[PDB]
Design a protein around this ligand. Sequence first.
Ligand SMILES: Nc1nc2c(ncn2[C@@H]2O[C@H](COP(=O)(O)OP(=O)(O)NP(=O)(O)O)[C@@H](O)[C@H]2O)c(=O)[nH]1
Ligand SMILES: [Mg+2]
Length: 159
Amino acid sequence: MTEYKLVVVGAGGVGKSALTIQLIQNHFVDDSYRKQVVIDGETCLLDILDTEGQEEYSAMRDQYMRTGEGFLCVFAINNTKSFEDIHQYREQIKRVKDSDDVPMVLVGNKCDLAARTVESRQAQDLARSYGIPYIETSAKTRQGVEDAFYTLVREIRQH
Ligand SMILES: Nc1nc2c(ncn2[C@@H]2O[C@H](COP(=O)(O)OP(=O)(O)NP(=O)(O)O)[C@@H](O)[C@H]2O)c(=O)[nH]1
Ligand SMILES: [Mg+2]
């Protein structure tokens, strides 16, 4: 069966681990993660690398990242700086993979929260300028969680 190596990147505290744990174990929180799912009738194995938001420079984090086939770029909708940093993570991904066209999905997490600081429209405009999908998610309520990982799989299938 096909294996997709997905990797979740973004600034610290945006919910990368929470999104991974909700998808894999189905509980909001507050190792290595693998799961066998069915996406558009196709049974497949998702292997998720959950990453740290800062790490100076490590050729081993670079090498581990380079193994990924698709990337969730996560910011948090009540963290304006996390949204401003998205560009840096896309640059790192491009660099690590030597490609300007890596399967990618922009993810605005914590959409259960009120008093957001980043409007949907800013992220949509950014994603549509990158030509990648934009999904809003909540690891608490689970809205969007499977949407973002499965959409990223679809970005890989259709690459
Ligand atoms: N309300 C709410 N809180 C969330 C959501 N996702 C994560 N959080 C909270 O935000 C905090 C950070 O989550 P975490 O998953 O650790 O983020 P991270 O990006 O993995 N952090 P790190 O980069 O340091 O590993 C936790 O308290 C977590 O419960 C969400 O969708 N909604
Ligand atoms: Mg984490």
